[PDB]
Design a protein around this ligand. Structure first.
Ligand SMILES: O=C(O)[C@H]1O[C@@H](O[C@H]2[C@H](O)[C@H](O)[C@H](O[C@H]3[C@H](O)[C@H](O)[C@H](O[C@H]4[C@H](O)[C@H](O)[C@H](O[C@H]5[C@H](O)[C@H](O)[C@H](O[C@H]6[C@H](O)[C@H](O)[C@H](O[C@H]7[C@H](O)[C@H](O)[C@H](O)O[C@@H]7C(=O)O)O[C@@H]6C(=O)O)O[C@@H]5C(=O)O)O[C@@H]4C(=O)O)O[C@@H]3C(=O)O)O[C@@H]2C(=O)O)[C@@H](O)[C@@H](O)[C@@H]1O
Length: 227
């Protein structure tokens, strides 16, 4: 009884360029499945035309992963000359009790390292400063360094918010509602890696493993701009 995101033409292109992973890194729906009306409790269209992702459990996900129309996985040069841009209009509801962090957009390398996570966090402490109920950028310092540089991007609102990730040469920028919030962060530690975008709900370190993380996207796309 769930309506499919594919019923909205605004999602046709990104779904053609995606596969859906749930609840782990296994594919539940490829692009052609998504375009044929795939819908489930963890991936459906709301009555006001949001693509909603929902998932429970530690490090579980309902997430779109960038694909080429050819069916190849996206694997662009992480620090190449071609610009890669992901844009999304996201409404982050107040999260259920026991949900402590939800990753909503990523740049991921083609192995086991996220270049960038954009996530909602119940709290974070950075250089001795604690912020609560904020949206955060996390950029890993390298494949062999588990630590990351963290940047508060936005106070959490339930309002629809525009996020834009721009990746070109060895630099990554994030704009939130038109304002640059991370300006040309260095990602040269991923020289020689290949990369792809992800978007959805990725549930990080819940304190209630049966609570549902929930994230809504009004618009989503990922594109190339050739230099
Ligand atoms: O400052 C402080 O507060 C403290 O910070 C502390 O340190 C922090 C860090 O700062 C940071 O916050 C860190 O965050 C971690 C997150 O919490 C979270 O755990 C995150 O999890 C990652 C995970 O590490 C992996 O990278 C994982 O990768 C998966 C991918 O997303 C993707 O789904 C992959 O899908 C592939 C499949 O796995 C298969 O390989 C599949 O195979 C296909 C082949 O391509 C082939 O074609 C074949 O033939 O067909 C198959 C097929 O189709 O099936 O391909 C797919 C594919 O699509 O590519 O799978 C990956 C996987 O292996 O699982 O993803 C998540 C993610 O980001 O999504 O990791 C974060 C991190 O480690 O950075 O947490 C730290 C912490 O908490 O400790 C401290 O420094 C502290 O001191 C500070 O105070």
């Amino acid at each position: 009884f769930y309506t499919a995101p594919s019923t909205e033409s605004k999602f046709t292109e990104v779904l053609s360029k995606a596969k859906l992973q749930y609840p782990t890194s296994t594919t539940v729906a490829f692009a052609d499945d998504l375009l044929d009306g795939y819908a489930a409790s963890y991936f459906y269209l709301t009555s006001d035309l949001y693509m909603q992702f929902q998932v429970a459990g530690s490090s579980q996900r309902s997430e779109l992963r960038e694909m080429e129309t050819s069916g190849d996985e996206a694997a662009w040069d992480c620090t190449g000359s071609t610009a890669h841009v992901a844009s999304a209009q996201i409404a982050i509801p107040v999260q259920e009790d026991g949900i402590e962090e939800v990753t909503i957009l990523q740049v991921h390398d083609s192995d086991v390292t996220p270049v960038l996570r954009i996530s909602w966090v119940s709290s974070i402490t950075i250089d001795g400063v604690t912020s609560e109920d904020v949206v955060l950028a996390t950029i890993r310092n390298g494949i062999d360094d588990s630590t990351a540089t963290k940047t508060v991007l936005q106070a959490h609102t339930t309002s629809r918010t525009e996020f834009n990730i721009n990746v070109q040469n060895s630099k990554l920028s994030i704009t939130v509602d038109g304002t640059t919030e991370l300006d040309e962060a260095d990602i040269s530690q991923f020289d020689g890696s290949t990369c792809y975008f992800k978007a959805g709900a990725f549930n990080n370190n819940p304190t209630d493993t049966s609570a549902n993380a929930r994230i809504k996207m009004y618009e989503l796309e990922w594109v190339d701009h050739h230099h």
